[PDB]
Coordinates of all heavy atoms in Angstrom, one line a residue:
Chain F
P15 N 151.2 160.1 4.8 CA 152.1 159.2 4.1 C 152.1 159.3 2.6 O 151.0 159.5 2.0 CB 151.7 157.8 4.6 CG 150.3 157.9 5.1 CD 150.3 159.3 5.7
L16 N 153.2 159.3 2.0 CA 153.4 159.5 0.5 C 153.9 158.2 -0.1 O 154.4 157.3 0.6 CB 154.3 160.6 0.2 CG 154.0 161.9 1.0 CD1 155.1 162.9 0.7 CD2 152.7 162.5 0.5
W17 N 153.8 158.2 -1.4 CA 154.3 157.0 -2.2 C 155.8 157.0 -2.1 O 156.4 155.9 -2.2 CB 153.9 157.2 -3.7 CG 154.6 158.3 -4.4 CD1 154.4 159.6 -4.2 CD2 155.6 158.1 -5.4 NE1 155.2 160.3 -5.1 CE2 156.0 159.4 -5.8 CE3 156.2 157.0 -6.0 CZ2 156.9 159.6 -6.8 CZ3 157.2 157.2 -7.0 CH2 157.5 158.5 -7.4
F18 N 156.5 158.1 -2.0 CA 158.0 158.2 -2.0 C 158.3 159.0 -0.8 O 158.5 160.2 -0.9 CB 158.5 158.8 -3.3 CG 159.9 158.4 -3.6 CD1 160.4 157.2 -3.2 CD2 160.7 159.3 -4.4 CE1 161.8 156.9 -3.5 CE2 162.0 158.9 -4.7 CZ 162.5 157.7 -4.2
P19 N 158.5 158.4 0.4 CA 158.7 159.2 1.7 C 160.0 160.0 1.6 O 161.0 159.5 1.0 CB 158.7 158.1 2.8 CG 158.9 156.8 2.0 CD 158.2 157.0 0.7
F35 N 148.2 160.0 -2.2 CA 149.5 159.8 -1.7 C 150.6 160.6 -2.4 O 151.8 160.3 -2.2 CB 149.8 158.3 -1.9 CG 148.9 157.4 -1.1 CD1 148.1 156.5 -1.8 CD2 148.8 157.4 0.3 CE1 147.2 155.6 -1.1 CE2 147.9 156.6 0.9 CZ 147.1 155.7 0.3
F37 N 151.3 161.1 -5.6 CA 152.0 160.4 -6.7 C 151.6 161.0 -8.0 O 150.5 160.6 -8.5 CB 151.8 158.9 -6.6 CG 152.2 158.1 -7.8 CD1 153.6 158.0 -8.1 CD2 151.3 157.5 -8.7 CE1 154.0 157.3 -9.3 CE2 151.7 156.8 -9.8 CZ 153.0 156.7 -10.1
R176 N 142.6 150.1 -7.5 CA 144.0 150.1 -8.1 C 144.6 148.7 -8.1 O 145.2 148.3 -9.1 CB 144.9 151.1 -7.3 CG 144.5 152.5 -7.4 CD 145.1 153.3 -6.3 NE 144.9 154.7 -6.4 CZ 145.3 155.6 -5.5 NH1 145.8 155.3 -4.3 NH2 145.0 156.9 -5.7
Ligands
CLA603 C1 151.5 153.7 -7.4 C2 152.7 153.3 -7.5 C3 153.7 153.4 -6.5 C4 155.0 153.4 -6.9 C5 155.5 153.2 -8.3 C6 155.8 153.5 -5.7 C7 157.2 153.6 -5.7 C8 158.1 153.4 -4.7 N1 157.8 153.2 -3.4 MG1 155.8 153.9 -2.7 N2 153.9 153.8 -1.9 C9 152.7 153.7 -2.7 C10 152.7 153.7 -4.1 C11 153.7 153.6 -5.0 N3 155.1 153.7 -4.6 C12 151.6 153.7 -1.8 C13 150.1 153.6 -2.2 C14 152.1 153.8 -0.5 C15 151.3 153.8 0.8 C16 151.3 155.2 1.5 C17 153.5 153.9 -0.6 C18 154.5 154.0 0.5 C19 155.8 153.6 0.4 C20 156.7 153.2 1.5 C21 156.3 153.2 3.0 C22 157.9 153.0 0.9 C23 157.7 153.1 -0.5 C24 158.9 152.9 -1.3 C25 158.9 153.0 -2.7 C26 160.1 152.9 -3.5 C27 160.8 151.5 -3.4 C28 160.4 150.5 -4.4 C29 161.6 149.8 -5.0 O1 162.6 150.4 -5.2 O2 161.6 148.4 -5.0 C30 161.3 147.7 -6.3 C31 160.2 146.7 -6.0 C32 159.8 145.6 -6.7 C33 158.9 144.5 -6.1 C34 160.5 145.2 -8.0 C35 159.6 153.1 -4.9 C36 160.2 154.4 -5.6 C37 160.0 152.8 -0.3 C38 160.7 154.2 -0.2 O3 160.3 155.1 -0.8 O4 162.0 154.1 0.1 C39 162.7 153.0 -0.4 C40 159.3 152.6 1.1 O5 159.9 152.4 2.1 N4 156.5 153.5 -0.8

Side-chain angles (χ1 to χ4, degrees):
Chain F
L16 310 171
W17 71 289
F18 203 31
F35 299 117
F37 168 67
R176 297 160 170 173

